[PDB]
Amino acid sequence: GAMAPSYRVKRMDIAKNDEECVVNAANPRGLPGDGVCKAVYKKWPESFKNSATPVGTAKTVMCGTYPVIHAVGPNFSNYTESEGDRELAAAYREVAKEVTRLGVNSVAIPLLSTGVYSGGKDRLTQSLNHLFTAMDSTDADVVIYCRDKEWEKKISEAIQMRT
């Protein structure tokens, strides 16, 4: 565990993280994909051996000794708001189980279903609150990675609100 488990946010490519493991915003088929998934494929392509896994689940594959946790959020283009919400919460609960099982002291995590799987909606608050529900009972240092300056400010504010 971390000495004083924390949440932080950074605005940069998750493929350059400084944590003991990474969460991929995966697709169910283990394909290179786009966005975070493509950056993860470039950096850790070995981790895509038998990484296919259903929506709402996480599957870890080692790249050397570095764990890549493939977390499959719902594509809100395909799911109803209600079913999508249930699967998005479930994907994060499976991430918390994997982070715990691995015994890591830190994890780099993107906001699932906020990019090409958002169904064109802003899901910062929805995705971040499911991340907190899952990760609050873990003792790993969590570092959330984002792209956009306005998202960094909103994520930082949500973290600081609780402290």
Ligand X SMILES: O=c1cc[nH]c(=O)[nH]1
Is 27 marked as binding a ligand? yes
Contact indicator for 60, 69 with CB cutoff of 8 Å: yes
Composition of the chain by helix, strand, coil, percent to 5: 40, 20, 40
**Closer Cβ to ligand X, 1 or 157, answer by number:** 157
Cβ distance to Cl ion smaller for residue 91 or 135: 91
Answer whether 159's CB lies under 8 Å from 129's CB.
no
**Pseudo-torsion of CA 116, 120, 126, 128, nearest 10°?**
40
96 binds ligand X (CB under 6 A): no
Distance between CA atoms of 59 and 80, rounded to whole angstroms? 24
Q: Is 152 in the site for Cl ion (CB under 5 A)?
A: no
Identify any residues that bridge with 24 across adjacent strands, giving them in sequence order: 70
Contact between 17 and ligand X by CB under 6 A: the answer reads no
Find tokens 């990675």 and name the residue: 145
Please, what is the minimum distance in Å from the beta carbon of residue 49 to Cl ion? Answer: 22
Regarding 157 and contact with ligand X (CB under 6 A), the answer is: no
| Residue 36 touches ligand X, criterion: CB under 6 A | yes
Residue 14 partner contact from ligand X, Cl ion, none using kind-dependent CB cut-offs of 5 to 8 Å: none
User: Taking contact as CB under 6 A, which single stretch among the options 13-21, 30-38, 42-50, 54-62 is the one that binds ligand X?
Assistant: 30-38
Number of H helices, E strands in the chain: 4, 6
Closer residue to ligand X in complex, CB, 99/144: 144
Among 21, 37, 61, 71, binds ligand X (CB under 6 A): 37
Residues that bind Cl ion (CB under 5 A): 12-13, 115, 117
